[PDB]
Amino acid sequence: SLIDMYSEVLDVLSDYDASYNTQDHLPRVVVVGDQSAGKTSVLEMIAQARIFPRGSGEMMTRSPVKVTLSEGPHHVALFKDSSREFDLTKEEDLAALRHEIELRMRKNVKEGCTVSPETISLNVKGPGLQRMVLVDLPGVINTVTSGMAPDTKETIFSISKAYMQNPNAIILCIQDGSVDAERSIVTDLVSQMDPHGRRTIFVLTKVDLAEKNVASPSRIQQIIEGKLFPMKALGYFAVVTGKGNSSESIEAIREYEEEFFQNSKLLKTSMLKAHQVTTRNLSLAVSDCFWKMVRESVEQQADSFKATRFNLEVREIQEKLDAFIEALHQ
Amino acid sequence: SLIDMYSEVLDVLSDYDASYNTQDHLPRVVVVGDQSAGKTSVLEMIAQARIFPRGSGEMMTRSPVKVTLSEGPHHVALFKDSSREFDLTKEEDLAALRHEIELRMRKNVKEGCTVSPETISLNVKGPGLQRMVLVDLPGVINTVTSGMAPDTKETIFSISKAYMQNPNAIILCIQDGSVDAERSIVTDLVSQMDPHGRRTIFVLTKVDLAEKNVASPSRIQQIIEGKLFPMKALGYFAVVTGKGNSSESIEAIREYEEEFFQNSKLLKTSMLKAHQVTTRNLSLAVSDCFWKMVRESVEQQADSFKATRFNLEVREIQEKLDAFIEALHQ
Numbered sequence: 014s015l016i017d018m019y020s021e022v023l024d025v026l027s028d029y030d031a032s033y034n035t036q037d038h039l040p041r042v043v044v045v046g047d048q049s050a051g052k053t054s055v056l057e058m059i060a061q062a063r064i065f066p067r068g069s070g071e072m073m074t075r076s077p078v079k080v081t082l083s084e085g086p087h088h089v090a091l092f093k094d095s096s097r098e099f100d101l102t103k104e105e106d107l108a109a110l111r112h113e114i115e116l117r118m119r120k121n122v123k124e125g126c127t128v129s130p131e132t133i134s135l136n137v138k139g140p141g142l143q144r145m146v147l148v149d150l151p152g153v154i155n156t157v158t159s160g161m162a163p164d165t166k167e168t169i170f171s172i173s174k175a176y177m178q179n180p181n182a183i184i185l186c187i188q189d190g191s192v193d194a195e196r197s198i199v200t201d202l203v204s205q206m207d208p209h210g211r212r213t214i215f216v217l218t219k220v221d222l223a224e225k226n227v228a229s230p231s232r233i234q235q236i237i238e239g240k241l242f243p244m245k246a247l248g249y250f251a252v253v254t255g256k257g258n259s260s261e262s263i264e265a266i267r268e269y270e271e272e273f274f275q276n277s278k279l280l281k282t283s284m285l286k287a288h289q290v291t292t293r294n295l296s297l298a299v300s301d302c303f304w305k306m307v308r309e310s311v312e313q314q315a316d317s318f319k320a321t322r323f324n325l326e327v328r329e330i331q332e333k334l335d336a337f338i339e340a341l342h343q
Numbered sequence: 344s345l346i347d348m349y350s351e352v353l354d355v356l357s358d359y360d361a362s363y364n365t366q367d368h369l370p371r372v373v374v375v376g377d378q379s380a381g382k383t384s385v386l387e388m389i390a391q392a393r394i395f396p397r398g399s400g401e402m403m404t405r406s407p408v409k410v411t412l413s414e415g416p417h418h419v420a421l422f423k424d425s426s427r428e429f430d431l432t433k434e435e436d437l438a439a440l441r442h443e444i445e446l447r448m449r450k451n452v453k454e455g456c457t458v459s460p461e462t463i464s465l466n467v468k469g470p471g472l473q474r475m476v477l478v479d480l481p482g483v484i485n486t487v488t489s490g491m492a493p494d495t496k497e498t499i500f501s502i503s504k505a506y507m508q509n510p511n512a513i514i515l516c517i518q519d520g521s522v523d524a525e526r527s528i529v530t531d532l533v534s535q536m537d538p539h540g541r542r543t544i545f546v547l548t549k550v551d552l553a554e555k556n557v558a559s560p561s562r563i564q565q566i567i568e569g570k571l572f573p574m575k576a577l578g579y580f581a582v583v584t585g586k587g588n589s590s591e592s593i594e595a596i597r598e599y600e601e602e603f604f605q606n607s608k609l610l611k612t613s614m615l616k617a618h619q620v621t622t623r624n625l626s627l628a629v630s631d632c633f634w635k636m637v638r639e640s641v642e643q644q645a646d647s648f649k650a651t652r653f654n655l656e657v658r659e660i661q662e663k664l665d666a667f668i669e670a671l672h673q
């Protein structure tokens with residue numbers, strides 16, 4: 014419940030005063046990537062539910078979506094400051110929840126705008142879920158298409174920058190394996206925010222399409238070894254997080270990914286490695302990295318609180334953080 | 344043979360003095376688009392031969408390739424200033440020609456460079472070929488990958504600008520239908536060079552992949568009607584110019600495209616139109632547009648020659664152009 018404590022420190026910290034005495038440098042896992050690279054698909058394989066706007070060919074995530082993942086006895090979801098439990102095993106609840114999320118996303122987008130920086134906050138609890146706080150972000154673009162507000166590209170870059178810029182955020186850089194590395198839009202921003210790769214994890218999606226279309230299966234190995242993209246990362250993972258145009262289920266997608274990798278030239282040849290491979294493996298590394306960064310960040314931000322009290326002399330913000338750092342040490 | 348006359352005016356005009364008294368404003372069809380959008384694939388369906396470096400996932404066209412297409416009794420290809428006929432019906436000739444083109448492309452790229460502006464010139468003659476002069480260009484990129492020279496992205500933009508900037512060039516804007524319109528790299532340059540769409544033709548490739556993956560088949564109609572991409576064009580065509588990772592044959596690809604479109608929801612519903620559809624249709628429009636622009640350009644460039652002779656007072660350049668404008672009027 015300490016993930017529960019953490020998240021309440023997070024969403025009472027916002028609020029968002031935003032100043033010298035109150036910086037928000039607490040770890041979140043921030044999911045960035047070109048439009049349709051599969052950011053939301055990765056999120057849904059980790060949350061294990063089909064609940065968010067998702068689809069190929071167009072802009073689907075039009076505002077940030079903050080998901081706190083915690084352990085629980087039933088797969089459930091609740092909005093922030095709400096008591097309604099959506100039962101993620103019931104299709105009627107899933108369908109209702111998809112509608113409720115789309116409606117809030119549409120509500121956030123003001124009249125002459127295409128995208129919003131207003132967050133949608135949701136808790137997902139479930140048996141065996143990794144504990145973590147993620148933020149799914151709008152896909153970065155290069156071309157503003159007809160109907161969109163003219164500023165949309167720069168607004169989307171601005172929303173991604175706002176979250177990657179937090180020095181203790183984990184940057185989960187989602188990279189479409191089915192599209193030439195040279196076509197990538199997000200690489201430059203990722204490289205600016207974390208030049209040395211101290212808090213970035215790299216995810217290559219759609220490797221099944223890569224085999225089904227690409228003329229150099231060694232370039233996949235070159236990517237996963239950090240040798241192709243001009244950026245650094247703590248780790249590199251290859252992943253299969255969907256198939257086709259129609260929404261499948263999480264279990265169908267997980268089966269498909271397992272089949273693909275166990276039949277893939279890349280693993281049987283040991284071109285790339287087994288620990289580098291499924292979303293499950295990515296999940297574990299991301300959770301480890303998130304918790305390590307939380308344990309290395311809270312005190313120094315305890316520290317900040319301490320500095321604030323007197324240096325000058327942040328009220329109940331400091332004591333929620335103090336309760337959490339209390340629990341945190343076993 | 345007047346296409347033959349034209350081409351010799353072209354490649355004796357280069358040379359390339361490049362000045363006030365000698366601008367090169369003669370029509371060429373200039374094939375531009377993001378890396379792997381399928382520029383070379385379109386060229387090969389029009390030339391009807393598998394001879395050029397081509398493939399998904401990486402940079403394949405590393406220098407401009409000028410192809411003059413003319414009518415002939417046998418499908419043949421010759422390099423500029425060469426007598427060797429490659430018989431495009433013989434696989435040994437095709438294979439040799441692929442090797443010879445790759446070798447010249449590699450020869451053009453200087454030691455610390457990735458791409459070259461040095462052209463490779465080739466004549467392809469054949470029964471029923473459209474008559475035309477095309478220039479296949481390197482794919483525009485957004486991210487310089489490891490191993491490439493650092494300037495490569497700007498050099499590639501510079502090579503494309505050099506050719507689109509000719510005020511009488513037809514810009515053949517090749518646009519990958521399998522990747523979100525918002526991800527497009529080349530749209531902005533196309534919009535700069537021909538803002539009003541007076542000399543641009545728009546080609547949407549990979550519509551088969553679009554059906555096999557994309558979540559809005561109405562967006563294809565919106566693209567072909569000029570209503571999605573922030574650019575203007577004289578016309579819009581949807582096209583299928585390959586399939587998979589292994590090189591098929593031109594005839595296999597043409598069969599595949601015919602099958603796909605005749606079984607496609609888009610044509611049977613008449614979402615988009617039949618004249619808007621195959622590469623063959625694109626071919627005819629591009630040839631018509633090229634010849635119209637030649638007939639509307641040569642005299643005014645006859646005009647230029649005339650101006651040069653005395654205004655001041657370009658030697659045998661003017662008389663080849665004069666011979667061609669002579670023939671040109673039946």
Ligand SMILES: Nc1nc2c(ncn2[C@@H]2O[C@H](COP(=O)(O)OP(=O)(O)O)[C@@H](O)[C@H]2O)c(=O)[nH]1
Binds near residue numbers: 050053221222255
């Ligand atoms: N074949 C294949 N398709 C995928 C994979 N991952 C995602 N997709 C598809 O890509 C589409 C766009 O994904 P989405 O999650 O909305 O991307 P986002 O905009 O980056 O959040 C989804 O509808 C999936 O169908 C994969 O590993 N393989």
Ligand SMILES: Nc1nc2c(ncn2[C@@H]2O[C@H](COP(=O)(O)OP(=O)(O)O)[C@@H](O)[C@H]2O)c(=O)[nH]1
Binds near residue numbers: 381398551
């Ligand atoms: N499925 C499908 N694949 C295509 C189509 N057009 C091209 N391709 C594939 O896309 C790959 C990259 O094409 P290429 O012509 O080298 O692109 P270029 O870099 O833009 O010149 C080719 O190897 C083809 O296999 C199409 O209409 N459908």
Ligand code: BEF
Binds near residue numbers: 049074150152153
């Ligand atoms: F539409 Be995605 F999430 F970029």
Ligand code: BEF
Binds near residue numbers: 382383481
């Ligand atoms: F490699 Be391509 F011709 F852009």
Ligand SMILES: [K+]
Binds near residue numbers: 049068070073074
């Ligand atoms: K998407």
Ligand SMILES: [K+]
Binds near residue numbers: 403404
């Ligand atoms: K290519």
Ligand SMILES: [Mg+2]
Binds near residue numbers: 052152
């Ligand atoms: Mg998304």
Ligand SMILES: [Mg+2]
Binds near residue numbers: 384404
């Ligand atoms: Mg090419």
